[PDB]
Design a protein around this ligand. Structure first.
Ligand code: ADP
Ligand code: MG
Length: 376
C-alpha cells in the first residue's frame, strides 16, 4: 500500500488512500501536519517536527528549517546565497559543489535532512497501516529541475521509502479538487504557504493537465506574516513594559509561537487575546503580556505581503496567454490561503470565487495519495 507525502518547505503532510476516500494521517503529536524542521539537542538526540519547531529561536544553531530551498542546488546558486543570508544555521559548500549544512560540527545534506522529516512521516504512516511503509508518492514544486527532483527522491530512499512517482505540487492539488474528471478548463493554482508563494496556471484537456506558466516569490510565505506580528508585539511591549524581548530567547520563542496562533485564529474570528503569563523577569518584578488583537489590526500589518503576491499572478497569465475570463476555476493551496483577506485578493485577481473545497495545507498530500492508489 502506498502513501502520498507532501514534503513542504515549512510543514509536511502524509496521506494514504482509504478505498475511494482520501485519508490524512495524524502524527504522534495528533497533528495532521508535521513541521519540516530537524534539530539536534545538546544532549545529542535528534528532534523532528513540532518538538523541533518549539526550539528554533532558543537553539538557532542546531536547528535546520526551510532546507527545501537548498535541496538539489549548488552552493553557488543565487537561491542558496539569498537563503544563506536569512538563516541562523551554518550553510556549507559540499565537496561536489552542492550546498550542505553543519550542526555540532558534523555535516548534513539537504537530502539527508529531508529524509529525517520523511522518517517521521513514514513513522506516522506505519502507525496507521501497521507493518511497514515501503511505497510512497512524493510531491515537488513545478519549478524543480532534474537535479532537485533526484535529491528529493534521495531523501525518500534514505528513509527507506520506494519513491514510485514524483508529481508536481500544483498537479497534486488538482487531483485533490477532483478536476481529474473534468472535460476542459484552464485553472490557476494559488499556493501561499509557510515559506514560499507559488502561482501556477494549468490546462486540462480530456483529463490530462499541462503547466502553462509558473511564477511567484520563493521568499514570501507565512513565516513573514509571523515575524511581522512578532515585531509588532515586541514593539507594543517596549511601549508598555519598557523591555525589549529580543534579549530573552525563550521569551522570543514563546512570542513567535503565540504570534502564529494569533494569525491562525484571526482567519475564523475577528478578535483574539494573547496572554503570556510570566514572560520576562524584570528588576521591578515578573512582567506579563496581555494583548487584544483584531483582524483589522492584523490585515494592516501584513497588507504589504498580501499585495506582493499580486504581480507574480498577473505575469503568469501573460506567460500562459490567458485572461480573467479564460481561467475557469481557482483553487487555493497552503494554510496561509485561509486568511480571509488573502482570499479576497484572489477573488479580486481572477474575477471568480476561489475554490475552498480542500484543506489548503492538505491538498498537495491528498493529491499525492490519489496518485498512490492509482499506482497500486
Ligand atoms: N487556519 C490558518 N489561518 C491562517 N494561517 C494558517 C492557518 N493554518 C496554517 N497557517 C499558516 O500557513 C502556513 C502553512 O503552510 P503549509 O500548509 O504547511 O504549506 P507548506 O508547509 O507546504 O509551505 C504556516 O506558516 C501557518 O502559519
Ligand atoms: Mg505547500
Amino acid at each position: 500500500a502506498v502513501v502520498g507525502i507532501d514534503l513542504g518547505t515549512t510543514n509536511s503532510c502524509v496521506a494514504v488512500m482509504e478505498g475511494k476516500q482520501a485519508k490524512v494521517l495524524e502524527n504522534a503529536e495528533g497533528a495532521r501536519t508535521t513541521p519540516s524542521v530537524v534539530a539536534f539537542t545538546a544532549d545529542g538526540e535528534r528532534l523532528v517536527g513540532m518538538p523541533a519547531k518549539r526550539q528554533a529561536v532558543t537553539n538557532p544553531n542546531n536547528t535546520f528549517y526551510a532546507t527545501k530551498r537548498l535541496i538539489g542546488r549548488r552552493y553557488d546558486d543565487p537561491e542558496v546565497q539569498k537563503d544563506i543570508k536569512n538563516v541562523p544555521f551554518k550553510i556549507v559548500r559540499a565537496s561536489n559543489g552542492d550546498a550542505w549544512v553543519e550542526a555540532h560540527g558534523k555535516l548534513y545534506s539537504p537530502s539527508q535532512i529531508g529524509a529525517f522529516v520523511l522518517m517521521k512521516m513514514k513513522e506516522t504512516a506505519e502507525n496507521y497501516l501497521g507493518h511497514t511503509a515501503k511505497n510512497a508518492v512524493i510531491t515537488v514544486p513545478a519549478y524543480f529541475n532534474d537535479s532537485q527532483r533526484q535529491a528529493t527522491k534521495d531523501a525518500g530512499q534514505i528513509s527507506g521509502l520506494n519513491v514510485l512517482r514524483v508529481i508536481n505540487e500544483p498537479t497534486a492539488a488538482a487531483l485533490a479538487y477532483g478536476l481529474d474528471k473534468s472535460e476542459d478548463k484552464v485553472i490557476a493554482v494559488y499556493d501561499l504557504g509557510g515559506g514560499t508563494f507559488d502561482i501556477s496556471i494549468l490546462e486540462i484537456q480530456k483529463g490530462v493537465f499541462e503547466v502553462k506558466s509558473t511564477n511567484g516569490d520563493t521568499f514570501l510565505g507565512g513565516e513573514d506574516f509571523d515575524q511581522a506580528l512578532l515585531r509588532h508585539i515586541v514593539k507594543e511591549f517596549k511601549r508598555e513594559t519598557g523591555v525589549d524581548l529580543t534579549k530573552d530567547n525563550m521569551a522570543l520563542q514563546r512570542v513567535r509561537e503565540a504570534a502564529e496562533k494569533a494569525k491562525c485564529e484571526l482567519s475564523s474570528s475577528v478578535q483574539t487575546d494573547i496572554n503570556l503569563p510570566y514572560l520576562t523577569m524584570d528588576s521591578s518584578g515578573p512582567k506579563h503580556l496581555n494583548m487584544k488583537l483584531t483582524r483589522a489590526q492584523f490585515e494592516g500589518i501584513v497588507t504589504d505581503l498580501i499585495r506582493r503576491t499580486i504581480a507574480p499572478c498577473q505575469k503568469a497569465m501573460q506567460d500562459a496567454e490567458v485572461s480573467k475570463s479564460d481561467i475557469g476555476e481557482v483553487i487555493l493551496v497552503g494554510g496561509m490561503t485561509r486568511m480571509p483577506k488573502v482570499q479576497q485578493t484572489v477573488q479580486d485577481l481572477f474575477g471568480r470565487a476561489p475554490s475552498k473545497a480542500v484543506n489548503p495545507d492538505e491538498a498537495v498530500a491528498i493529491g499525492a495519495a490519489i496518485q498512490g492508489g492509482v499506482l497500486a
